[PDB]
Amino acid sequence: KNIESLFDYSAGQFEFIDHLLTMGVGVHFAALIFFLVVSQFVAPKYRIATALSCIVMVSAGLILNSQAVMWTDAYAYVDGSYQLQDLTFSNGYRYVNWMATIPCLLLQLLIVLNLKGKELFSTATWLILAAWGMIITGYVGQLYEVDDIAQLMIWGAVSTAFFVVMNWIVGTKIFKNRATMLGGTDSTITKVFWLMMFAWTLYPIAYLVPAFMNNADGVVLRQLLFTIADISSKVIYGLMITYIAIQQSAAAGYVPAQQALGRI
Ligand SMILES: *C/C=C(C)/C=C/C=C(C)/C=C/C1=C(C)CCCC1(C)C
Ligand SMILES: CCCCCCCC/C=C\CCCCCCCC(=O)O
Ligand SMILES: CCCCCCCC/C=C\CCCCCCCC(=O)O
Ligand SMILES: [Cl-]
Ligand SMILES: [Cl-]
Ligand SMILES: [Cl-]
Ligand SMILES: [Cl-]
Numbered sequence: 001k002n003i004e005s006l007f008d009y010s011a012g013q014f015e016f017i018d019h020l021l022t023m024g025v026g027v028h029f030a031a032l033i034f035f036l037v038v039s040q041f042v043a044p045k046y047r048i049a050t051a052l053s054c055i056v057m058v059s060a061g062l063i064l065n066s067q068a069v070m071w072t073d074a075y076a077y078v079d080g081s082y083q084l085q086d087l088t089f090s091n092g093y094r095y096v097n098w099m100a101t102i103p104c105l106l107l108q109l110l111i112v113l114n115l116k117g118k119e120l121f122s123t124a125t126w127l128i129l130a131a132w133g134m135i136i137t138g139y140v141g142q143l144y145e146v147d148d149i150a151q152l153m154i155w156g157a158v159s160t161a162f163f164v165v166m167n168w169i170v171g172t173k174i175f176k177n178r179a180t181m182l183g184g185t186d187s188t189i190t191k192v193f194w195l196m197m198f199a200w201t202l203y204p205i206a207y208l209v210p211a212f213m214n215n216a217d218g219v220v221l222r223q224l225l226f227t228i229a230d231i232s233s234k235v236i237y238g239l240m241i242t243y244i245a246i247q248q249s250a251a252a253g254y255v256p257a258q259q260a261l262g263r264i
Pocket of ligand 4: 045
């Protein structure tokens with residue numbers, strides 16, 4: 001069902017994909033240690049936002065690790081190239097994991113936006129429903145990336161509709177609650193919005209790779225786009241969320257935050 005199964009891979013193509021996934025594991029678990037240590041400098045009001053980054057680091061890191069082992073399990077060097085064996089490789093597990101990681105990325109944004117109570121519960125509910133609609137329709141579409149490209153594009157259009165509506169909720173909440181943010185993070189949160197628009201858009205681009213580059217080099221390109229998008233949407237994004245959480249904690253008088261920012 002996946003275009004990965006259609007091709008043999010040169011030693012260079014196979015080893016580069018292996019190193020891309022392995023490097024992605026190292027980056028996420030290295031960042032995990034950072035968010036863990038820094039969490040003690042976050043005020044209790046925002047500490048959930050930094051803990052969610054730790055949850056995203058292990059969740060994304062485990063999928064990248066699972067993809068890397070599946071990649072080496074599925075292919076062996078036979079007659080001068082890496083060829084498919086018994087076990088299969090698939091990108092579908094990324095979609096299943098997004099069902100958990102995307103709500104975590106959205107929740108930590110709502111936390112540093114100083115949303116509370118019923119507006120927090122209502123906004124998160126609509127964001128998660130829009131995200132799940134996007135992921136499920138996209139998962140169904142990529143099942144047809146070999147057998148029915150036309151069906152992959154129609155499911156992608158439905159998924160893009162959820163994507164655009166989700167981004168409109170995110171943008172509306174950011175620019176409406178930007179005024180409530182402390183320590184100059186009202187400026188920083190606008191860059192987080194544009195980082196999200198850039199990084200999250202890489203995923204539909206990779207989703208369309210079977211339509212404009214259905215060959216072994218397109219397989220490499222898709223994993224490369226996934227690596228750029230994962231690092232930007234989770235690691236860099238989490239580093240900006242954590243900075244915003246620390247800066248607002250210090251502005252609100254949290255002494256550990258003031259001492260942490262003061263020592264650097
Ligand atoms: C850390 C993982 C993230 C931020 C995943 C983001 C996923 C998306 C933004 C989903 C994108 C899709 C569309 C925009 C329509 C085509 C199918 C979906 C999955 C790829
Ligand atoms: C924040 C951005 C993170 C970027 C992560 C990717 C880092 C490595 C990127 C690729 C460099 C180009 C590698 C050359 C590809 C060789 C083609 C091939 O033989 O398959
Ligand atoms: C084993 C696979 C390769 C492992 C590579 C290890 C290198 C990881 C490098 C950094 C990952 C990002 C985490 C850095 C924490 C924040 C850095 C900062 O505060 O500027
Ligand atoms: Cl607090
Ligand atoms: Cl507080
Ligand atoms: Cl993920
Ligand atoms: Cl073959």
